[PDB]
Structures are given as C-alpha cells and as structure tokens.
C-alpha cells in the first residue's frame, strides 16, 4: 500500500485473508470460491484498467 513495510519485511500479517478464496479454517471452502479464483488469476499481471 502507501508504505509497503510488509512486502519488504516479507511478513504477511494482512494479506493472507483479503478474499473469499483465501485459506479458510479447516479448509472449509467458501462460497464463490469457484469464481474469485478464476477472477483473480485472470487479473494478475494485467492491471486494473484492463482487469475491468
């Protein structure tokens, strides 16, 4: 984000749980996990202006 002290430090205290397809406890898959993946592996390397 504004100051990426997280990527730099390598820590991931805030990224592991931002989307519904993130690791859910006991691997109880969320709902719409069939899609969000398909909608974020698509928009990866393609910026937003072209993820839209």
């Amino acid at each position: 984000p504004f100051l990426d002290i997280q990527k730099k430090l390598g820590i991931s205290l805030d990224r592991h749980f931002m989307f519904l397809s993130a690791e859910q406890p006991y691997k109880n898959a969320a709902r719409c996990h069939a899609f969000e993946k398909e909608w974020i592996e698509c928009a990866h390397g393609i910026g937003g202006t072209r993820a839209k």
């Binding site: 984000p1 504004f2 100051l3 205290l13 805030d14 989307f19 519904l20």
Partner: protein, 344 residues
C-alpha cells in the same frame, strides 16, 4: 503524565498512522484510523482547561462518526465483492462515502468547522500533531484508492476548501485559528490533484509539513496565540522575524520561495489534464490567502508594534532556544526552489 502513559499514548498516536499506511486490508486501515482517534484525545485535554474539554468532545464526535462511515464503506464493499478492499468494480456510492468520511477526518470543505475550533482550544504543540501527523493517515487511504474516486466531488471539496480556508482566515486574528484555516486551504490543493497525480499530493503535503512545523514552533517559541502577541516578536527574539516573514509568504504562493512549487506543479498537472476552469479559480483565491499572511507580516515584521515595559525583563533572561529543527526546516522550506526538478 506518568512517563509510561506518555509512551503508550505517543506510541499509539504513532502506530496509528503507520498501521494505516502499511496495511492493505482495509479493515486494518480502519483500526489504524481508530487508534489515532483514541491516542490524540488524551493529549488534547492536558491543561484540562474548560476550553479543552470542549475541544476534545467535538474532535471526538466528528472523528467517531466519520470513522463509523468509513467502516460502513468497508462493510458494504465486503458484500459487493468478497474482498476487504476497494476495487475497480466498487459501487460509486461506496467510494463517495469514503471520500466524504475521510474528508471529515481530514476536515476538508463543508466539514471544515471542527478543525478551526479544535485548533483553537489545544496547545500549540498538540496543534501541530493535530494538523500534520494526523493528516498523513487519512490521506494515505485516499492516495491508495485514487484511481477509483470521483473527479467531480474531489474538485468541489477542493475548491470549497480553498475558499472557506481563505475567507475564514481573513477575519481570524487568533493565530492557532489562522493556521487551522490555512491547513484547510492547503489540504484543498492536495485533494485536488489526487485523482490525477497522487505523487503531487505527497509533495503538496510534505512542503506543507516542512512549512507549518517551523511556523508553529515559531508561534510557541514566544507562545503567542495572538498576532498582537507575535507582533512584539521584534523585542522578544529579533532573528526569527526574518524567517517568520519568508515562511508565511512561502505558505502562500509567492514565486521565489519553495511554496510556489506545490501550487505551480499542481496547476501544471491540472492544465495537462485540462482543468483550466477549476485550476484558474483555485489559483485566484489562493491569492486571498497571501493577503492575510501579509497582514500578519505587516504586524510582526514590516511594522514595529508598541511593546510593554515588562518585556525588557523577558529580554534580560536568556531565551530558551528554538530546537535545531526550526532552522533545518525553515531553510529547506523557504528556499529549495532552485532544486524543484528533483523534488517532483
């Protein structure tokens, strides 16, 4: 303050903006905003004077409702996109809420009423923190989300702030409130270029911080909350009269000094983006800000106001010095203009 408490609070007032900036999960950005709200309130009432309790109770209610509105935006997003963070798809109303809310915490435009009043009842010191280390947090959240916010609203809040700040300042004679009003104005320029070139917002802020921090440590060197009080500067400490003169004209946009660059490049970027309507009106009333800056100049430097005999007594005693920061932040601010290209 039991020095331990001082540490916990100060850490929070400092962990508050830093969590906001570092995190991406908006939630964690919200609590960063929440911690800043909790940490600042104790310091605000340190004198515990009747004016102070009023200040904090206003600052807190204004800050709290805005915090709740920012949370609502995050809660709504969570249902329009499972993500905990604004995305291209975000409903426009969702973002506009965040603009209004964040423009309340930063105190821009039609929500500019709380700041002048809290800046009036808090000490000069806590005034600085309330003006400059508490603007970093919300602005971070906006700068991160710039690609998505509305160009129309920002501009309206921008222009309004410029006007309100300027007009408000003209009448004020209390210094704390003159600064509060200036901050509203500068904050306006900053939010004008956010949709177009966020990187310039971060310049129009730093320069504001490098200008305001010396200006306030100047006001408190003699702890003068009145212009009449700063006008007798010539007797209390004569040297700061020279730089106080340039820093205030620098705060307004006059060309040789560092203060022109933020306005100049913001105008260049807005004209590059074709807002030659908006940019023109902003620059024009920006000129109103210098009028009240120069009126203070008149009282403090260009003309010598009459002083009191008891002042001779304060001269005798050695004047506790101004920290080094004053100098390093007065010069880097009054004259860096020859080095603009690398700043931007």
């Amino acid at each position: 303050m039991n020095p331990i408490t001082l540490a916990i609070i100060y850490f929070t007032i400092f962990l508050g903006p830093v969590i906001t900036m570092s995190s991406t999960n908006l939630m964690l950005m919200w609590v960063g905003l929440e911690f800043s709200l909790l940490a600042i309130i104790p310091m605000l009432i340190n004198k515990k004077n009747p004016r102070s309790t009023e200040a904090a109770t206003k600052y807190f209610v204004t800050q709290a409702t805005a915090s709740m509105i920012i949370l609502l935006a995050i809660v709504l997003n969570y249902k329009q996109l499972g993500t905990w963070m604004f995305q291209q798809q975000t409903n426009g109303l969702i973002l506009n809420m965040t603009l209004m809310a964040l423009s309340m915490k930063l105190g821009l435009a039609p929500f500019h009423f709380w700041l002048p009043e809290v800046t009036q009842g808090i000490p000069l010191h806590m005034g600085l923190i309330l003006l400059t280390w508490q603007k970093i947090a919300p602005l971070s959240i906006l700068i991160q989300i710039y690609p998505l916010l509305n160009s129309t609203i920002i501009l309206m809040l921008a222009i309004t702030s410029i006007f309100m700040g300027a007009w408000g300042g003209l009448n004020q004679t209390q210094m704390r409130k003159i600064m509060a009003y200036s901050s509203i104005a500068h904050m306006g320029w900053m939010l004008a270029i956010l949709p177009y070139n966020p990187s310039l917002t971060l310049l129009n802020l730093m320069i504001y911080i490098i200008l305001t921090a010396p200006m306030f440590m100047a006001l408190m060197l003699n702890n003068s909350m009145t212009i009449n009080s700063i006008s007798l500067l010539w007797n209390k400490t004569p040297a700061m009269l020279t730089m106080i003169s340039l820093m205030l004209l620098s705060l307004g946009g006059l060309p040789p000094l560092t203060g022109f660059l933020p306005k100049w490049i913001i105008i260049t970027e807005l004209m590059k983006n074709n807002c030659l309507i908006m940019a023109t009106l902003m620059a024009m009333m920006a000129l109103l800000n210098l009028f009240f800056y120069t009126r203070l100049i008149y009282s403090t430097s260009l003309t010598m106001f009459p002083t009191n005999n008891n002042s001779k007594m304060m001269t005798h005693q050695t004047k506790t010095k101004p920290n080094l920061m004053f100098s390093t932040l007065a010069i880097m601010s009054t004259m860096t203009l020859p080095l603009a290209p690398q700043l931007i």
